[PDB]
Design a protein around this ligand. Structure first.
Ligand SMILES: O=C(O)c1[nH]c(-c2ccc(-c3nnn[nH]3)cc2C(F)(F)F)cc(=O)c1O
Ligand SMILES: [Mn+2]
Ligand SMILES: [Mn+2]
Length: 178
């Protein structure tokens, strides 16, 4: 199909390998679940851009194998005393000293935000939701990043959506899930 062709066109080889490993973990196949494959790449890329926009302000938990990722979280918790989250989060902010959960949605940002908040119900983990329409939503409206960084992210997301559209993959992608 053209969805896996596109993923391999637009996402750098590391991100693809990581999303393919993520899929192969629970038995999902990128050549069948092509929309989940695109979503995995996209969210991986946003996480990586987020941490790259920060002396390293952000520690990236997402994309690591569960063993390594928990090791990183447990370390952060012992040295900072921060509360240990129930679900492995996406980033750690050393400036604000808080974990972050990153969401990327094809739906309304507040729908997905409520979904994530209710999922985590840990007051300590910060939530930042991005859409493919240049919208964001974030705990207490603390967007963590400066305007240019969040614009770089919004732009890339919009660009993925528009590349899917030029290839006629957008309507399938947006009706698929989050
Ligand atoms: O594993 C994580 O940590 C994680 N997993 C997801 C996620 C969950 C379900 C689907 C899906 N799509 N269609 N069926 N299921 C896709 C994703 C993806 F965004 F990673 F692609 C979102 C997070 O934000 C997150 O942090
Ligand atoms: Mn995650
Ligand atoms: Mn996430």
């Amino acid at each position: 199909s053209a969805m896996e062709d596109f993923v391999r066109q637009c996402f750098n080889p590391m991100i693809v390998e990581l999303a393919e490993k993520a899929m192969k973990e629970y038995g999902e196949d990128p050549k069948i679940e092509t929309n989940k494959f695109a979503a995995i790449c996209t969210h991986l890329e946003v996480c990586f851009m987020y941490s790259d926009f920060g002396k390293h302000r952000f520690e990236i938990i997402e994309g690591r194998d569960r063993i390594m990722a928990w090791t990183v979280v447990n370390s952060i918790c012992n040295t900072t005393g921060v509360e240990k989250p129930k679900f492995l989060p996406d980033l750690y902010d050393y400036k604000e000293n808080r974990f972050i959960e990153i969401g990327v949605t094809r739906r309304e940002v507040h729908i997905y935000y409520l979904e994530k908040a209710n999922k985590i119900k840990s007051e300590k983990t910060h939530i930042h939701i991005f859409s493919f329409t240049g919208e964001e939503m974030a705990t207490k409206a603390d967007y963590t990043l400066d305007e240019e960084s969040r614009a770089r992210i919004k732009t890339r997301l919009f660009t993925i959506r528009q590349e899917m559209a030029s290839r006629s993959l957008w309507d399938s992608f947006r009706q698929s899930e989050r």
